[PDB]
Amino acid sequence: MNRGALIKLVESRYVRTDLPEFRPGDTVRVSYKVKEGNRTRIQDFEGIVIRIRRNGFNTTFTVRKVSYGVGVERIFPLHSPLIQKIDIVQRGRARRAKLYFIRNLSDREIRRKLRADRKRIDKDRAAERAAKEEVQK
Amino acid sequence: MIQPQTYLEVADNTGARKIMCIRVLKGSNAKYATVGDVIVASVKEAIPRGAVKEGDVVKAVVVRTKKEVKRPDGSAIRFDDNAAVIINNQLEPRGTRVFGPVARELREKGFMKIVSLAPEVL
Amino acid sequence: AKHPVPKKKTSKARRDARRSHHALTPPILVPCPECKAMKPPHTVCPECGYYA
Amino acid sequence: MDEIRIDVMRASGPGGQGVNTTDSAVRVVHLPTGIMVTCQDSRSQIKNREKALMILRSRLLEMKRAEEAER
Amino acid sequence: RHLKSGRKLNRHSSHRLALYRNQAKSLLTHGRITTTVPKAKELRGFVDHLIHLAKRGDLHARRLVLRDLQDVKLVRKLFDEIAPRYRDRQGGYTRVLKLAERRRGDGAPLALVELVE
Amino acid sequence: MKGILGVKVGMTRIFRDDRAVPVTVILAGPCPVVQRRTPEKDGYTAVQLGFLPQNPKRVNRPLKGHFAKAGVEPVRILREIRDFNPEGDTVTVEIFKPGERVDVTGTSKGRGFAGVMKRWNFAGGPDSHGAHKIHRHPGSIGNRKTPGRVYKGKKMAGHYGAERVTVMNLEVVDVIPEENLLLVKGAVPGPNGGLVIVRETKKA
RNA sequence: UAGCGAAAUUCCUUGUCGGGUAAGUUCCGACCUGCACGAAAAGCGUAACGACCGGAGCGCUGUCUCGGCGAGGGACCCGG
RNA sequence: UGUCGGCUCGUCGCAUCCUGGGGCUGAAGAAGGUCCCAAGGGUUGGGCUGUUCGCCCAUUAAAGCGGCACGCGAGCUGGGUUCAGAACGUCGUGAGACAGUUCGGUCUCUAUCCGCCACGGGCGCAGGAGGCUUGAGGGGGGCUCUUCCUAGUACGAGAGGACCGGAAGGGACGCACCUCUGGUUUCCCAGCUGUCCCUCCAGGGGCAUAAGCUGGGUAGCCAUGUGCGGAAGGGAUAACCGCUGAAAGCAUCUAAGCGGGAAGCCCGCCCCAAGAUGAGGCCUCCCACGGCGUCAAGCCGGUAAGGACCCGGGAAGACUACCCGGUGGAUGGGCCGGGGGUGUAAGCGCCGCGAGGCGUUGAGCCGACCGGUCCCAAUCGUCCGAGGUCU
Ligand SMILES: [Mg+2]
Ligand SMILES: [Mg+2]
Ligand SMILES: [Mg+2]
Ligand SMILES: [Mg+2]
Ligand SMILES: [Mg+2]
Ligand SMILES: [Mg+2]
Ligand SMILES: [Mg+2]
Ligand SMILES: [Mg+2]
Ligand SMILES: [Mg+2]
Ligand SMILES: [Mg+2]
Ligand SMILES: [Mg+2]
Ligand SMILES: [Mg+2]
Ligand SMILES: [Mg+2]
Ligand SMILES: [Mg+2]
Ligand SMILES: [Mg+2]
Ligand SMILES: [Mg+2]
Ligand SMILES: [Mg+2]
Ligand SMILES: [Mg+2]
Ligand SMILES: [Mg+2]
Ligand SMILES: [Mg+2]
Ligand SMILES: [Mg+2]
Ligand SMILES: [Mg+2]
Ligand SMILES: [Mg+2]
Ligand SMILES: [Mg+2]
Ligand SMILES: [Mg+2]
Ligand SMILES: [Mg+2]
Ligand SMILES: [Mg+2]
Ligand SMILES: [Mg+2]
Ligand SMILES: [Mg+2]
Ligand SMILES: [Mg+2]
Ligand SMILES: [Mg+2]
Ligand SMILES: [Mg+2]
Ligand SMILES: [Mg+2]
Ligand SMILES: [Mg+2]
Ligand SMILES: [Mg+2]
Ligand SMILES: [Mg+2]
Ligand SMILES: [Mg+2]
Ligand SMILES: [Mg+2]
Ligand SMILES: [Mg+2]
Ligand SMILES: [Mg+2]
Ligand SMILES: [Mg+2]
Ligand SMILES: [Mg+2]
Ligand SMILES: [Mg+2]
Ligand SMILES: [Mg+2]
Ligand SMILES: [Mg+2]
Ligand SMILES: [Mg+2]
Ligand SMILES: [Mg+2]
Ligand SMILES: [Mg+2]
Ligand SMILES: [Mg+2]
Ligand SMILES: [Mg+2]
Ligand SMILES: [Mg+2]
Ligand SMILES: [Mg+2]
Ligand SMILES: [Mg+2]
Ligand SMILES: [Mg+2]
Ligand SMILES: [Mg+2]
Ligand SMILES: [Mg+2]
Ligand SMILES: [Mg+2]
Ligand SMILES: [Mg+2]
Ligand SMILES: [Mg+2]
Ligand SMILES: [Mg+2]
Ligand SMILES: [Mg+2]
Ligand SMILES: [Mg+2]
Ligand SMILES: [Mg+2]
Ligand SMILES: [Mg+2]
Ligand SMILES: [Mg+2]
Ligand SMILES: [Mg+2]
Ligand SMILES: [Mg+2]
Ligand SMILES: [Mg+2]
Ligand SMILES: [Mg+2]
Ligand SMILES: [Mg+2]
Ligand SMILES: [Mg+2]
Ligand SMILES: [Mg+2]
Ligand SMILES: [Mg+2]
Ligand SMILES: [Mg+2]
Ligand SMILES: [Mg+2]
Ligand SMILES: [Mg+2]
Ligand SMILES: [Mg+2]
Ligand SMILES: [Mg+2]
Ligand SMILES: [Mg+2]
Ligand SMILES: [Mg+2]
Ligand SMILES: [Mg+2]
Ligand SMILES: [Mg+2]
Ligand SMILES: [Mg+2]
Ligand SMILES: [Mg+2]
Ligand SMILES: [Mg+2]
Ligand SMILES: [Mg+2]
Ligand SMILES: [Mg+2]
Ligand SMILES: [Mg+2]
Ligand SMILES: [Mg+2]
Ligand SMILES: [Mg+2]
Ligand SMILES: [Mg+2]
Ligand SMILES: [Mg+2]
Ligand SMILES: [Mg+2]
Ligand SMILES: [Mg+2]
Ligand SMILES: [Mg+2]
Ligand SMILES: [Mg+2]
Ligand SMILES: [Mg+2]
Ligand SMILES: [Mg+2]
Ligand SMILES: [Mg+2]
Ligand SMILES: [Mg+2]
Ligand SMILES: [Mg+2]
Ligand SMILES: [Mg+2]
Ligand SMILES: [Mg+2]
Ligand SMILES: [Mg+2]
Ligand SMILES: [Mg+2]
Ligand SMILES: [Mg+2]
Ligand SMILES: [Mg+2]
Ligand SMILES: [Mg+2]
Ligand SMILES: [Mg+2]
Ligand SMILES: [Mg+2]
Ligand SMILES: [Mg+2]
Ligand SMILES: [Mg+2]
Ligand SMILES: [Mg+2]
Ligand SMILES: [Mg+2]
Ligand SMILES: [Mg+2]
Ligand SMILES: [Mg+2]
Ligand SMILES: [Mg+2]
Ligand SMILES: [Mg+2]
Ligand SMILES: [Mg+2]
Ligand SMILES: [Mg+2]
Ligand SMILES: [Mg+2]
Ligand SMILES: [Mg+2]
Ligand SMILES: [Mg+2]
Ligand SMILES: [Mg+2]
Ligand SMILES: [Mg+2]
Ligand SMILES: [Mg+2]
Ligand SMILES: [Mg+2]
Ligand SMILES: [Mg+2]
Ligand SMILES: [Mg+2]
Ligand SMILES: [Mg+2]
Ligand SMILES: [Mg+2]
Ligand SMILES: [Mg+2]
Ligand SMILES: [Mg+2]
Ligand SMILES: [Mg+2]
Ligand SMILES: [Mg+2]
Ligand SMILES: [Mg+2]
């Protein structure tokens, strides 16, 4: 009975590792399996990461964006079977965890407040185009 | 959540700008109202010589809430502010072009007339 | 002196009755490894000592 | 009378713990016309009811003499 | 209701905190200390941590124990005599023992926080 | 009338076909039959179902004889299930099929000596104008001389919770026999470790 | 008389009309039918000034929908 | 014998506002009128006024009436009324007066008894002891709207628009739960200020609350969040519909008898429960007196099964009780792994005059959650406890 953990982790066979890295302070777009009137589609959602709530399974994350004058946020179950493809577009400096403070000043300052994490930027573009040539030959 | 005495913005061009919820139209004694619901409200201000003037008691349907809406598929979505659209007893917008995103919930309520004019059907 | 006021002088019979469970309960002691002195359970003792 | 609703209630103003309980301030209303008249100066309901009604009568009268002569 | 949390303490944050630190300083000074049953039990956990943290070495760990114990000479001793003595004695670096005495006046149950050996 | 014991192990959420569903996780290990009481031997039909293993030394009680009476490893706990004499010598999670709805009884968390407001979710009292004496206070309780007393069972503060609570019509989600696990529709009484029973609901 | 006037004065009275509000026995403008103003027990008015009394709006908020959690001093247990 | 209204908590009545059923209709259908049956449950938010009352806005299935000292001030409020001040109209020569107005105006920490909500101690239960139970009796719960399908059919000139049977969704309310969303999380982590100190720099503590301020936060508790409940169904019955049917050759639902028929009643569901002294039942364990009592009625030291004390400790808990563990051991505490929170420690190196910046680095630190390991601590021992009446 000393498996209180693993037990919860057994039904947790709904896991998914087809999902890149992304720490708060970097914009990212996700194609969600959104059902239209009756059919199914993949409405793209393009925004920055605000919250990341880690709790083993069901560990969700939030994404807020500007839309025609209004700001809209969305919380996504990380290992949700409806996250077709979560694509990274640009990473930046964190210096925070839950950065709701962007709500306050969502302007050209929010850009100079959220820098460009050249650290991960390099590691990303490099490891990408570097391991590509390896998978080639 | 939207209750009486609540100020909502106007996502359409009905001329209205801000309206205070007079009441939530639902069960005998509702308590709140979120995206998709319809509420009796009063215009607390409107564009000069608009289609609807200050003090007009109209019925409107929520389009955006500050309180995130839960999705059956575990998903969640929250807006920056609370707004709606002045409707007809025919449950159709008194105005046309309705700028500003909406919600997919409006779809299961028969307000497709809205969603068609709503650019960002999020 | 305020609202809370006893109505009647509690009969001396009821008083004692009240203090029924009021009686004490003798302490608990056991013989010790050192002397024959009676140490309280799970405890050391003066003029006795201990180990480890 | 069948169209005159009579309502009673606690008077308003001084009257010690009397007025507080001893209500009986009369107030009538002509349902079809929606014109009510009230009175709470006397210490007795009936005394007021008489006023209230008779007053209403006077009101309606002039309202009838109004249109009647208006025509 | 809500003791689902960890342990228990009296006084107020600042106080109880300084309390632990004080009983720590005093403890590492004499080794065998007498106090109340609870104060001991809690103090037990607190001290062991400092000892095991001292079991380490890096000056960071040092400066870390310098947040609780202030006396540089005292902490110095910890990284010299105290820690080594308990080498390879992972966990339970101290001992708690019930005393038969009872503080007069308040009837307090005394005890002992002994540095195992 | 299906019936099997188990304990609440925790709860997360799964994904049905393309929708999210919060579910609770129970553990229905093998429950050895101990005493199939017939109406002849008693007056009602039922079955004593054991549970967790035991240090044979702790069960030195006459329980030893009761266990040996059916010849079984000394379990820890055992209760009855009215109107239910199945088969074999042990019940399992195989009893429930993904789709059947079940009733689960548990022991609610004890909220100790809870206040009226907390207990029966009352209204309380004015936080502003009114005297800082009756914020969370039942206020009135009775009338004048008539009746002069208090209606028995009048909702008052006090020790509340930690009792027998039965939740109903929880649909059986994915059941994995591979580990004696069982998934249900989430909201289940009792903490993470309480002994609960799972029976057959009454839809019709 | 001037002036003021359902008034710190208007019983009928939530007078009537206009304004403010979704809705206003209160509030403001106005008429006069002043139960019961009115010229030094002063009349009408008035910048500024009140911990003075009334109405509205903005801002904001556990006042409220409606409550939840947390801290400490009591309460509670033991010794005096 | 504290007096309005308000708040809080309600409970009862039925002359029923709603939902339930039913008769008649000047009842086509829809909708309605009126009368009968029927409290089980429900019976909104707001503007104005001290108000009750009422008027009004928006809605509603409906926004019921009344009793309980027009329920409730040892539960609260104090706007009203009901002292002293003051004022206007006002009557009085006046002092003063006004169910005539206006402004202000001290509601008293300790519950003995009954009663009510919770919890324990004692005895009892004609052997002792452990586990599981029976359900007498009682408590809880009883609401409802909306779209569509049947079918735009029956009905109807038309506009409209059914019964019945079925499905789906929503409100309010109840119970329970932390997965998710959301909250708190008093030292979990970090940033920041003034200052005093350690130790000059770096680094670091106290204090600015009872956290100094701020950014964020697991477990826990929790609602805004999640699940589930009202029901089905059996039985009897209400007003009522009807049968056979005489009195009374006809007639009649009744006078014998019989059937159908309510959100109501009984049962069913859920919770308590043999102090059900009418003390129930089941399964299992231990068993003789060893001595006085001639009898009857009892006592005594030791025992058995088994329990208690003490100790570590708990989502259990004021206390006590409840629950597991107590070396034949993972009970807590420490240590290690993990989950989790924060968000690149310290030190050193590099760049820049410098504040700082870069790397070392998802680093360091790290409460409660999940699990492991005997380093610390549950060492040791004590008391109790049928030996079971008569026919
Ligand atoms: Mg899978
Ligand atoms: Mg995926
Ligand atoms: Mg620019
Ligand atoms: Mg205007
Ligand atoms: Mg429509
Ligand atoms: Mg469109
Ligand atoms: Mg468009
Ligand atoms: Mg005596
Ligand atoms: Mg005694
Ligand atoms: Mg008077
Ligand atoms: Mg009265
Ligand atoms: Mg009277
Ligand atoms: Mg009288
Ligand atoms: Mg008079
Ligand atoms: Mg507690
Ligand atoms: Mg401090
Ligand atoms: Mg610790
Ligand atoms: Mg609680
Ligand atoms: Mg609560
Ligand atoms: Mg509650
Ligand atoms: Mg209630
Ligand atoms: Mg309230
Ligand atoms: Mg007060
Ligand atoms: Mg006071
Ligand atoms: Mg007081
Ligand atoms: Mg009273
Ligand atoms: Mg005027
Ligand atoms: Mg008047
Ligand atoms: Mg008026
Ligand atoms: Mg006029
Ligand atoms: Mg007017
Ligand atoms: Mg007007
Ligand atoms: Mg207007
Ligand atoms: Mg207003
Ligand atoms: Mg008006
Ligand atoms: Mg004129
Ligand atoms: Mg005069
Ligand atoms: Mg004058
Ligand atoms: Mg004069
Ligand atoms: Mg004069
Ligand atoms: Mg003047
Ligand atoms: Mg002036
Ligand atoms: Mg002055
Ligand atoms: Mg003044
Ligand atoms: Mg409050
Ligand atoms: Mg608390
Ligand atoms: Mg507190
Ligand atoms: Mg406290
Ligand atoms: Mg004392
Ligand atoms: Mg209530
Ligand atoms: Mg009917
Ligand atoms: Mg009818
Ligand atoms: Mg018909
Ligand atoms: Mg017709
Ligand atoms: Mg009832
Ligand atoms: Mg109100
Ligand atoms: Mg108001
Ligand atoms: Mg107002
Ligand atoms: Mg008012
Ligand atoms: Mg009022
Ligand atoms: Mg009126
Ligand atoms: Mg209306
Ligand atoms: Mg009543
Ligand atoms: Mg009264
Ligand atoms: Mg009262
Ligand atoms: Mg009072
Ligand atoms: Mg009162
Ligand atoms: Mg009283
Ligand atoms: Mg006052
Ligand atoms: Mg007043
Ligand atoms: Mg007054
Ligand atoms: Mg005079
Ligand atoms: Mg006043
Ligand atoms: Mg006053
Ligand atoms: Mg005091
Ligand atoms: Mg008492
Ligand atoms: Mg009884
Ligand atoms: Mg019963
Ligand atoms: Mg047709
Ligand atoms: Mg046709
Ligand atoms: Mg036709
Ligand atoms: Mg025809
Ligand atoms: Mg036809
Ligand atoms: Mg049509
Ligand atoms: Mg019909
Ligand atoms: Mg729907
Ligand atoms: Mg939670
Ligand atoms: Mg949470
Ligand atoms: Mg800290
Ligand atoms: Mg701090
Ligand atoms: Mg400092
Ligand atoms: Mg100092
Ligand atoms: Mg530095
Ligand atoms: Mg310095
Ligand atoms: Mg200091
Ligand atoms: Mg100092
Ligand atoms: Mg500090
Ligand atoms: Mg100071
Ligand atoms: Mg201080
Ligand atoms: Mg903080
Ligand atoms: Mg926060
Ligand atoms: Mg939390
Ligand atoms: Mg609490
Ligand atoms: Mg709720
Ligand atoms: Mg129903
Ligand atoms: Mg429902
Ligand atoms: Mg039925
Ligand atoms: Mg017939
Ligand atoms: Mg015949
Ligand atoms: Mg016949
Ligand atoms: Mg007939
Ligand atoms: Mg007859
Ligand atoms: Mg029925
Ligand atoms: Mg029925
Ligand atoms: Mg019953
Ligand atoms: Mg003998
Ligand atoms: Mg005998
Ligand atoms: Mg014991
Ligand atoms: Mg034990
Ligand atoms: Mg032992
Ligand atoms: Mg352990
Ligand atoms: Mg442990
Ligand atoms: Mg521990
Ligand atoms: Mg993490
Ligand atoms: Mg760095
Ligand atoms: Mg370098
Ligand atoms: Mg530079
Ligand atoms: Mg520097
Ligand atoms: Mg720290
Ligand atoms: Mg860790
Ligand atoms: Mg050991
Ligand atoms: Mg070791
Ligand atoms: Mg003995
Ligand atoms: Mg004996
Ligand atoms: Mg014999
Ligand atoms: Mg015989």
Tab-separated table of C-alpha atoms (C1' of nucleotides) in Angstrom, chain F residues 8 11-13 22 35 37 41-42 44 48 57-58 60-63 65-66 76 78-80 82 101 105 108-113 118-119 122-124 126 129-131 134 137-140 142-146 149-157 159-160 162 164-166 168-170 185 187-192 199 202-203, chain H residues 1-3 6-11 67-73 75-78 109 114-119 129-135 141 174-181 220-223 226-233 269-272 281-285 305-307 315-318 324-330 370:
chain	number	residue	atom	x	y	z
F	8	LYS	CA	-9.548	6.564	-1.021
F	11	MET	CA	-7.921	11.940	-7.154
F	12	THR	CA	-6.815	13.623	-10.372
F	13	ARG	CA	-8.470	14.011	-13.772
F	22	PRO	CA	-12.294	14.841	-12.755
F	35	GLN	CA	-19.196	-15.194	7.036
F	37	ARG	CA	-24.887	-15.090	7.049
F	41	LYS	CA	-28.262	-18.488	10.707
F	42	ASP	CA	-29.400	-14.912	11.364
F	44	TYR	CA	-30.845	-11.338	6.790
F	48	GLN	CA	-18.330	-10.344	5.846
F	57	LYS	CA	0.736	-11.332	16.475
F	58	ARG	CA	-1.603	-8.337	16.703
F	60	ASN	CA	-4.083	-12.827	18.866
F	61	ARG	CA	-7.720	-12.011	19.609
F	62	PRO	CA	-10.407	-14.719	19.235
F	63	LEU	CA	-10.501	-13.268	15.726
F	65	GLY	CA	-10.772	-18.587	15.418
F	66	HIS	CA	-13.133	-16.514	13.289
F	76	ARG	CA	-7.434	-5.795	9.290
F	78	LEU	CA	-14.261	-6.438	7.811
F	79	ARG	CA	-17.865	-5.306	7.330
F	80	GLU	CA	-21.122	-6.633	5.874
F	82	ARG	CA	-26.800	-6.596	2.927
F	101	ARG	CA	-23.016	3.660	-11.323
F	105	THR	CA	-20.116	5.551	1.777
F	108	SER	CA	-16.338	12.768	6.328
F	109	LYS	CA	-13.435	14.803	7.662
F	110	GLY	CA	-13.903	15.923	11.257
F	111	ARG	CA	-14.286	19.672	11.515
F	112	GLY	CA	-14.148	19.533	15.306
F	113	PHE	CA	-16.274	21.887	17.391
F	118	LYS	CA	-19.411	27.121	9.414
F	119	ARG	CA	-21.685	24.213	10.297
F	122	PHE	CA	-25.790	30.417	8.241
F	123	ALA	CA	-25.888	34.137	7.528
F	124	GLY	CA	-24.075	35.434	10.583
F	126	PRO	CA	-23.568	42.704	10.383
F	129	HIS	CA	-23.106	49.080	12.212
F	130	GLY	CA	-23.969	46.273	14.635
F	131	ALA	CA	-22.166	45.664	17.920
F	134	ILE	CA	-22.657	38.862	17.249
F	137	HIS	CA	-23.920	34.376	15.993
F	138	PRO	CA	-27.177	32.375	15.637
F	139	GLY	CA	-29.002	35.430	16.953
F	140	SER	CA	-32.471	34.294	18.007
F	142	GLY	CA	-37.047	30.737	20.090
F	143	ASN	CA	-40.110	32.771	21.022
F	144	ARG	CA	-41.598	34.326	24.157
F	145	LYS	CA	-43.401	32.428	26.921
F	146	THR	CA	-44.977	30.253	24.237
F	149	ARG	CA	-38.460	26.000	25.009
F	150	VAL	CA	-36.356	24.996	22.021
F	151	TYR	CA	-37.315	22.763	19.102
F	152	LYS	CA	-35.297	19.558	19.433
F	153	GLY	CA	-32.587	19.387	16.791
F	154	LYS	CA	-32.401	23.152	16.433
F	155	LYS	CA	-29.307	23.857	14.343
F	156	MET	CA	-26.623	24.965	16.800
F	157	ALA	CA	-22.836	25.028	16.727
F	159	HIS	CA	-18.670	19.106	16.957
F	160	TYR	CA	-19.593	18.550	13.318
F	162	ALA	CA	-16.440	12.958	10.879
F	164	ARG	CA	-21.241	8.534	7.833
F	165	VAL	CA	-21.856	10.182	4.474
F	166	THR	CA	-23.193	8.450	1.382
F	168	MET	CA	-24.677	8.341	-4.895
F	169	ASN	CA	-24.738	7.611	-8.632
F	170	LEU	CA	-21.016	8.069	-9.225
F	185	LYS	CA	-16.751	10.491	-10.692
F	187	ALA	CA	-16.470	13.791	-5.254
F	188	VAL	CA	-15.991	11.090	-2.620
F	189	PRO	CA	-16.447	11.493	1.160
F	190	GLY	CA	-13.619	10.700	3.556
F	191	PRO	CA	-9.918	11.686	3.481
F	192	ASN	CA	-7.126	9.927	1.598
F	199	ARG	CA	-22.311	-0.661	-3.691
F	202	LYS	CA	-30.689	2.964	-7.256
F	203	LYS	CA	-31.462	4.569	-10.615
H	1	U	C1'	-43.887	41.944	31.669
H	2	G	C1'	-38.420	46.797	27.404
H	3	U	C1'	-41.980	49.566	23.727
H	6	G	C1'	-34.651	46.324	10.773
H	7	C	C1'	-31.244	41.896	11.373
H	8	U	C1'	-30.611	36.756	12.905
H	9	C	C1'	-33.072	32.035	13.599
H	10	G	C1'	-37.060	30.024	12.637
H	11	U	C1'	-41.466	26.973	13.626
H	67	G	C1'	-50.267	32.698	14.800
H	68	C	C1'	-46.160	32.275	17.971
H	69	A	C1'	-46.261	38.811	24.332
H	70	C	C1'	-48.781	41.822	15.958
H	71	G	C1'	-42.204	35.329	17.734
H	72	C	C1'	-37.229	36.706	18.788
H	73	G	C1'	-33.306	43.802	22.772
H	75	G	C1'	-29.259	37.174	20.235
H	76	C	C1'	-27.971	42.157	17.680
H	77	U	C1'	-29.315	47.003	15.949
H	78	G	C1'	-31.412	52.072	17.951
H	109	C	C1'	-17.516	41.310	30.243
H	114	C	C1'	-35.456	24.111	32.658
H	115	G	C1'	-34.735	23.701	27.374
H	116	C	C1'	-31.513	22.933	22.909
H	117	C	C1'	-26.579	21.629	20.186
H	118	A	C1'	-22.105	18.632	21.066
H	119	C	C1'	-18.873	15.437	24.212
H	129	A	C1'	-14.092	-11.360	26.707
H	130	G	C1'	-13.253	-9.646	20.924
H	131	G	C1'	-15.175	-8.623	16.083
H	132	C	C1'	-19.655	-8.136	13.115
H	133	U	C1'	-24.817	-7.050	13.296
H	134	U	C1'	-31.016	-6.676	13.771
H	135	G	C1'	-34.041	-2.028	13.100
H	141	G	C1'	-35.008	14.979	2.215
H	174	G	C1'	-28.736	20.323	0.263
H	175	C	C1'	-24.471	16.801	0.980
H	176	A	C1'	-19.540	15.860	0.054
H	177	C	C1'	-14.759	16.916	-2.286
H	178	C	C1'	-9.481	19.651	-4.035
H	179	U	C1'	-8.739	16.885	-9.901
H	180	C	C1'	-9.252	21.834	-12.618
H	181	U	C1'	-10.270	27.233	-12.218
H	220	G	C1'	-4.411	22.239	4.783
H	221	C	C1'	-8.847	24.713	5.142
H	222	C	C1'	-12.158	26.588	1.473
H	223	A	C1'	-16.154	28.851	-2.831
H	226	U	C1'	-16.016	19.692	-9.037
H	227	G	C1'	-19.284	15.539	-8.137
H	228	C	C1'	-23.853	13.801	-6.532
H	229	G	C1'	-29.356	14.330	-4.364
H	230	G	C1'	-35.188	15.740	-5.145
H	231	A	C1'	-36.640	10.439	-8.362
H	232	A	C1'	-37.948	5.726	-9.706
H	233	G	C1'	-41.095	2.041	-7.777
H	269	C	C1'	-33.376	6.604	-0.302
H	270	C	C1'	-29.940	8.836	3.442
H	271	C	C1'	-28.392	9.536	8.872
H	272	C	C1'	-28.844	8.102	14.328
H	281	G	C1'	-29.294	-11.697	17.216
H	282	C	C1'	-24.558	-13.965	14.957
H	283	C	C1'	-19.324	-15.805	14.785
H	284	U	C1'	-15.076	-16.778	17.818
H	285	C	C1'	-11.975	-17.070	22.319
H	305	A	C1'	-9.798	-15.005	27.437
H	306	G	C1'	-9.299	-10.070	27.392
H	307	G	C1'	-8.967	-4.883	28.895
H	315	A	C1'	-7.237	14.611	8.010
H	316	A	C1'	-9.761	12.152	14.919
H	317	G	C1'	-9.910	16.214	18.856
H	318	A	C1'	-11.578	22.155	23.595
H	324	C	C1'	-3.108	3.247	14.345
H	325	G	C1'	1.711	2.195	16.314
H	326	G	C1'	4.903	0.778	20.710
H	327	U	C1'	11.794	-2.965	18.867
H	328	G	C1'	7.875	-9.434	16.752
H	329	G	C1'	8.788	-1.514	15.131
H	330	A	C1'	8.599	2.911	10.138
H	370	C	C1'	4.477	11.034	-1.598
